[PDB]
């Protein structure tokens, strides 16, 4: 195809094109006279990558590599996914969003604005790839820890899709990052000469609803109803509203809502293997938030009902506390969702007296307030239940409800701890050394996405996410459970994803949800056939001959 | 896209490109300074078309028009489909096959040979269109009335696909004509300097079976398992064997076997509306052949069982005679299929004495022997049953079992006649004027194909063809039934196809056969959205603006 | 390049693509499984070509072949150029122009209209080839023998360029046929539903002059000042005016004016070899017309001055007669050009008495009136000069000034005859058998065009055409001169063109007219390197390797 082969990141191999490939593709001379394996390209990229003194510069190098040679980009990522996941995605992707340096060389993503309503199909036609299986659309309104970033949020889909392939196995060529720019309510960005967005207040209401309706409709008209559409950092109100709106109409899901809940329930079910106790013999106190503990609570209720527990006594075991006390009948501001987990109980003021009042086996704290798990709570919880469960799932480590070493000291080294912020290994007296598990959304969305794209699943119900949580809980080995670790190491995420992708797939074929008709007998080898690998293809034409008489030139 | 727009038949409009379209596409100057509607282009094509003195020259003009401007080609066809169906398809397409003049200007079709086994996916990649919904593959072994034509048979898929769109509504851009060249057992073609084929004896056996297996596998790998694959004029042995082989593995069907049977049963069910009698009160005598009367018999048995008649007494009403007499228990050479319709009965020698012995209401003659319906048979059949049924379904009019005016005279103008060869209107005494129906395969395969492609039906069972026959039987009006016409006029085929395409579609969604998930509420308007029309598209870019501030160029 | 290779006539070889070429180009399967040499393709085209009963159908086949496979098209033409020159060019090209059947499948030519003034560069951009060396622009106003054809005249450039390559050697890919549609003064075409033109009266005056000025300017801006621009059948007034306008500004020439004169002077100089006499010992009587005998007279005067004859006594030997008698000082309507060849002489009324009065050695009759060379003129001319010269250069054989057998009888078989209309061999008594030469413009314009394009000649002066006439005169062998033949057989035109192309080239480098700088030592082998041959190229990639260590893949 000539010089254009070296500009296509999905085709360009750089100095890994063999001489025959260079001669056949018509690109001989455009590449230095050096023929390299992908391993040498990887070591050269690593040598250049360690020269940087900041995470933003590492991000720039990785995004440039993705713009040049995407197979080498995913070779880099999958080489050590634990060390590049925080660089191409959160936390570094947000710090790069807020501090864009006109980064993306190759157009990476589709910017669809509110002023394009009615012409979204024409904009989808701008994307070069026309066989798209996954779409990660963002609004830029609630970037993790950064707030409203508007059009700067494009790095978040681009990043998360990079994890669809590095962690899952999704082809990074049927993936499309979309940014719906409806304006931004960020005065810092509005008064900025280097802002690349619309520079007006964020549109809301029926115009916004119609924009997203037409977006889902156009994406499914162009790419099929099986196109997996994931909603990225939308505002929690918009997030949950649109999730309930498009849940059963499109192959849509939300990772900030459902992936987080799945990871939390996976940690809980993994801790169940430490306590050697059934989920039915548990009671949960939460720190409810704006669809943060609500999804975890619903998924945990589903896990309870799975064991043959009716929904009534299943939701009986859930208590919610948020800056006001328990959720009892019509306390002050109970909404239609808080009343679902409302216990008819004396109104309790704060956390300490409810942890004392009902003896909890697991406290799941996601409230974005620090130190909410005071020492006395940990101590009397360890006294109540041997081997309790403490979940400081707040993302900002400065705002975590507890800390690893605090939980392990005050509980005398028998409190199963897990967080969402990186806590280093805690070594205590009595030889008690713990590796506290780190809950990561990359455990759920890559495997679920790979299974959904492999099977052509039409809708992603909550049963799929409970199943994902169960598989992740089964991923942890006994050796890691002894170390107090609740999630499998990220260095195995690929394999984990595969397993999830199979189980999900199984479910979809057991409940008539998958569209892929031939119904593979070996779903393991079927999913393995769709897993994208960074290994280079061969660009040499397949030559063959005919049996010497059918091939005759037939001269007169 | 420039000069290449005028070389693409699916895009080129010739002198129907408006000046703005010519300027936007960069083709201004390449087209004469004449701007035409499609009606003027149609009248000019017609004026040039009537200048020809042979049907082969008309075929050359139509194929050239298809190579130039396919929307005008299908405008021509759909303008008067009754007069162009015998030109782009049988009988003229065979006479053009045997007398090729190096016709096809644009590459129209894919020639896959036996010597390409193992590399068929690479050959499928040669086809420019990559979204293919229908594949009409031929072998060239049993072209209608012409015999083994080998690689000359390419005109038959190309022709039949032209009827998929002219009669049905199928997009003639997701249609792919394939010719599997395995050699030819035609000495006239082997010893021919102008033959375009392989020039060796036709390969058979396991090599041929493996070639077709790999062909179906490659077609479904590249184009999906929902790709409709129709088998064209294969040898009847190969035809039926491959039909039973790939019937339930792929979306495959055979029109020479199943479409013919559907048209015959449609004529029978339409004659049922003349006799005002139920199918249960009928007995059928056939002229069995090599899967010609066998398919009609099976479909008629299915029609009988549909009325709550058990299969035993249903197949009781079928008698088969072929140059040997009845099919009674082990007469001389009963196969595994003849024994299915075998009656325990005294062995009868010829046709006359079985028509006398069991009084038949319908004689379905497809045996390729002439005059087999002698005068005495017609007369005593008219005497036995008032308003009998005579079916001379033999294609060569020189070899038809009976004739229109003969059947109408000897039966005293009350014998419902139908054929497969064109019989002109018969005017008799007593003012008896009859328009004998002409059974045409174009009544079945376009509508069935449109329904299958619209609904993504995975397999085409015999119930679909019985349903097609029922719909076609319902297509005939009472005014035409009074004239003794059993099939709707071809000038309405489009509409007929649509109706079939809907009913088929209904069936597929009632029996969980369709893959298209969203499950349209209005299947009529859903199928109408996929019907291809010869009306030109607009090649003008959709221009629009932004609200005057988001569109600001933002100068420093 | 895939399926698009088979749509490019300059690349498509049809069934002459070898299996390796088909596999490398990605076109395997699109072509029948038959591998042919160009000789078999030629014989198949010939077999299909002889089936036609009209010249228009032969023209349609040849134009279709040019639209499919242009190398095979020029193989056909150059195979027997004498039998295809009257089919792809005059006289058949005009009969096809007037009787267009919406012929050209592939866009063949550029239609630039008067309403495109100011945007001609954008229209030149529509032509796919961007390296153009020759442009044959027509107006359609004075098609040979057909009159104003307007936009139907596009076949005339397309035809003449086909002779640039079949007769000359010009690459038919740096050739561009242009039609300047300024309207048409043809009421038959204006009131015609199938006319493809502008359908208004022909624009003239300053608008037309500005259109042609901008056309020459745009053609030379896009394709260089060395682009050879030939003016086709313009009106003689417009023809001569534009010729004098753009003669010394662009590489422009006119074949209806200058090629005709060159062929006539070539016939005269060839007859000089029969009379064994120098041109100085000759006197010429003409039948002057609207720049028909004027160009011949000027070129003949130049030939005279070449022999060291001053211009005065050189033009002394020219006499002009047109329906009024001689051209003497201010007879009735002498223009500024007739006065140049005006002799101070008694005013003569008709032709007979001037042929009697001044004894002419050569009568050059181009006046489009029949029988103007009456028997007595031929007889007394044969009596005056032994071995006279008679030139009935009128194109319509019905309007030729004389006839072959008449000239050969009345002159007693010693009158050197030549015409522009095909006169068959004349066999007379005394064993006198003559093959009268047929003057053809294809003797001049292909060779001159090939030399001009090879050398990058900037302007084509009249010296080049006199030199062309001299070379053509030298082309005739003594054996043909004995038969009374004055022009070489067309079956050698290629070679003739080459020789002309060299001599022209020599002249251009001797008078500092050629732009090609390196100044070839062997101009014969230089021109032979640019001669286009119908032989197919090889589309196989040039594969090679490196010395086993520079080619190492260099694994870690």
Swiss-Prot record, chains A, B, C:
Q: Which cofactor does it need?
A: Mg(2+); Mn(2+)
Cellular component GO terms held in the UniProt record: mitochondrial matrix; mitochondrion
**Residues that bind a divalent metal cation:** 232-233, 256
Q: Would you kindly state one Gene Ontology biological process term found in this protein's UniProt entry?
A: pyruvate metabolic process
Q: Which domain of life is it from?
A: Eukaryota
User: Where is this protein chiefly located?
Assistant: mitochondrion
Q: Which UniProt keywords apply?
A: Metal-binding, Mitochondrion, NADP, Oxidoreductase, Phosphoprotein, Transit peptide
Annotated site (Important for activity): 256
- UniProt keyword Metal-binding present: yes
Q: Which GO terms describe its molecular function?
A: malate dehydrogenase (decarboxylating) (NADP+) activity; malic enzyme activity; metal ion binding; NAD binding; NADP+ binding; oxaloacetate decarboxylase activity
Residues involved in NAD(+) binding: 142, 256, 395
Give the enzyme class.
Answer: oxidoreductase
Cite the cofactor comment. Answer: Divalent metal cations. Prefers magnesium or manganese.
- Entry comment describing in which tissues the protein is expressed: Expressed predominantly in organs with a low-division rate.
According to its UniProt record, the EC number is 1.1.1.40
Catalytic activity from the UniProt record: (S)-malate + NADP(+) = pyruvate + CO2 + NADPH; oxaloacetate + H(+) = pyruvate + CO2
Instruction: List where in the cell it is found.
Output: Mitochondrion matrix
Q: Which residues carry this modification: Phosphoserine?
A: 323
Q: Which residues of this protein are catalytic?
A: 89, 160
Q: Function, please?
A: Catalyzes the oxidative decarboxylation of (S)-malate to pyruvate using NADP(+) as a cofactor. Can also reverse the decarboxylation reaction, but only with significantly lower efficiency.
Q: Which NCBIfam families does the protein's record reference?
A: PRK13529.1
Q: Which family does it belong to?
A: Belongs to the malic enzymes family.
Would you tell me the protein name for this molecule?
A: NADP-dependent malic enzyme, mitochondrial
